[PDB]
């Protein structure tokens, strides 16, 4: 009905003398002894330039009227699986992106009702073609004609209320599109959840564009080709290294706080004591939190992972991508500046001295901690993205954030066990740290911050 | 050559007082007393926003003097750097700054004979009541004042291979009524605002997906809890039939349980579960030690009207713990198969659905995501009631939720290690399947994490 039906490009059509297979990635559908015409209708759906009425007529020409009605009933089964694209030629093509697919041609009242483009719909270049996408939609709109882009630009630029019955004349005057083409285009836009028939919704008003997009995309064999580029430990920044103490963990396995006691007594302490946190305390903290316990290589890894490290915290598929930069503003045995921590050698190498840029970062952390007292150490957790981006297409950054949270909890518990003053940070400036430390922001950028010091008795 | 219109930023506040003049922004403010008439005329025309830098310089030179004109031309670059000046090609497009240390560089004329293409991170969307082109790699935001610019961007994105202006500009000038000079100004602005790629992207950026880079750029850059009554401190009880959970003596566990160092050094992801499933008392102790409610309090002087807030064994941004735990049980000691919801204040379990094929589908998804090791015993699904946290944090809300999920993962790992359980986090799951299972709005509460728990073999 008022749409041209085409099979999804990922669908494979296996033609046998007495059976027929339609193969997708997740599932497949096989049917035995198909009468001709049904096979002809499926072949022309693979061609994908006919209407449902035309396909039903093709079935009826060879099989009969009852078989045509049966095929008309059968087609919605394939529509539900998301195997059938709906197009207004040659203007736009909706391809499904999710199962349990449903297309709903709206009532004619849309022509006299105020509408607007969803603020979650966005136009971008998928590869070599312009596409309209939305997290609120189970469809993906390939734009075949730039005049559709002009229509979208006109109505997004339009006022809050767009009434088709009154404003369609301006569109027919500025563009060469016919009225029926425009009505089909707007109908498909509304049906693919790209348009708002209602004025506003209280549940989605709280959501931001990037937040909702990230939530929808992350919540739904590769090879590490750049393994030589991204090693397990980051190459040494500066060879001048300050050693850190290594505590005997066997004695601390009995001297330290009980896990239950540490969990029940942990609190965020932002008022630091007068005696700053010592370098030995920082060394013990880093050794108990983010050290390298052992370096291993899987005996049979098809992904060419090579060497991977084990650390006190977990990470998705190993591939520990977190570096710790202990920016020191006030330490007992160290001068002010930004440093970098190496987990395998248990050393810290300086990155920058006490420049007003490092001071800007310190001031940001101090304001984010509530301006209770002057920070002593600020650990900045940075993510070398090339470590795991190859293995996870969409779920990479959420995994990185969850690892940052794990590291936050470990920091909290260890600092509570060491009578320190821990406090996580909500967010920071990634470009400022990219400038201070000289990093490739598309290859390694800061993703977390934590404030650490000494707590008064 | 200078070919852009300078306007005052809409985000900037102009304080016009007697004998003084103030330009107020969020990060910085610039005040100046005794302003000369030429500077005043230039600032007024910048408020108008219809002159180029050369025109403003000439006006300042005619009103205050030539040296004063040069001084104003030097001074205006500092205001441009702070992101206070928008650059527009009227009436086609206006670039507004969105980041400090702002800089606009008119590209060399060679761009007309060089192949270019639209950045795949540039996206058009409707913001407020106007069309806007944005990009995480750009320091600017383009307000599209004319739909013909949208048609140009559509033709450019639709165009295949490389687009060379010198060869293909004739088709754009013939299909649309835009003038050649207007088209060159538009393309110059697009190239200068990092919206166009003259090089084949880069190997480091190819690793990045659109949504990941957008989220990373937006998150890593007093409100009032108006809807507090809709999103309370504990979620309202789903079903009145409630199963109680065992409360362990935490004063005794404060000395009997293993040390924190022992738990951190012994912890590991265990996926091979025992033949004897995890009991209900173990699940109760686990939930009581991980995500129970310890106390309900109210801030003595809270201007945000936060109201009631709870304390819990794990930390969370600004308190207001918005995470709920649904323990989907496939095989437990004294609990039938089905989905449940954990109430931490009463320390209870309330059923949500029985062993339906969709609960089994969730179990199958978790089992495949955990490597198909034995059979899963309990799967905790961590969900986030967004309305409790979204009011306070606009952009960093979801990142805070993910970090909270990570904190809860680490707490689960440590407590399960201390209790000789079999913990294992899960990378991702199906949020819409869980939304279909439990009658919840996915825009108000949706699954954001998964964890698998069972018993470890001796
Ligand atoms: C992800 C995350 C970010 C946080 N960011 C901040 C912050 O920016 N400033 C701050 O004072 N506390 C921050 N905190 C700590 C919380 O404010 C703290 O958990 C809460 O205010 C008090 O909980 P407590 O019992 O640990 O003291 C953060 C905690 C987490 C988990
Ligand atoms: C955020 C996150 C997600 C994870 N997702 C999975 C998963 O989906 N499947 C799985 O088997 N393990 C998962 N894990 C556990 C890791 O695979 C595990 O840490 C690693 O493979 C082995 O480390 P460990 O045995 O020392 O704990 C996840 C861990 C984290 C932190």
Residue numbers in the entry:
A (entry chain B): 3 to 222, 233 to 469
B (entry chain A): 2 to 222, 233 to 469
Reported in the publication:
The long-wavelength beamline I23 at Diamond Light Source overcomes these limitations and extends the accessible wavelength range to λ = 5.9 Å. In this study, we report the determination of diverse protein structures by experimental phasing techniques carried out at long wavelengths on beamline I23 at Diamond Light Source using S, Ca, K, Cl, V, I, Cd, and P as anomalous scatterers. We demonstrate that long-wavelength native-SAD has become a very compelling technique, where a low multiplicity dataset from a single crystal can be sufficient for successful structure determination, making it a general vehicle of choice for experimental phasing.
Using this protocol, we selected 10 projects solved by S-SAD phasing at the beamline, including soluble and membrane proteins. Structures varied in size with molecular weights ranging from 14 to 114 kDa, sulfur contents varied between 0.9 and 6.5%, and diffraction resolution from 1.8 (detector limited) to 3.4 Å. The overall multiplicity for these datasets was below 26, which is four times lower than the multiplicity typically needed for S-SAD at shorter wavelengths (100)10.
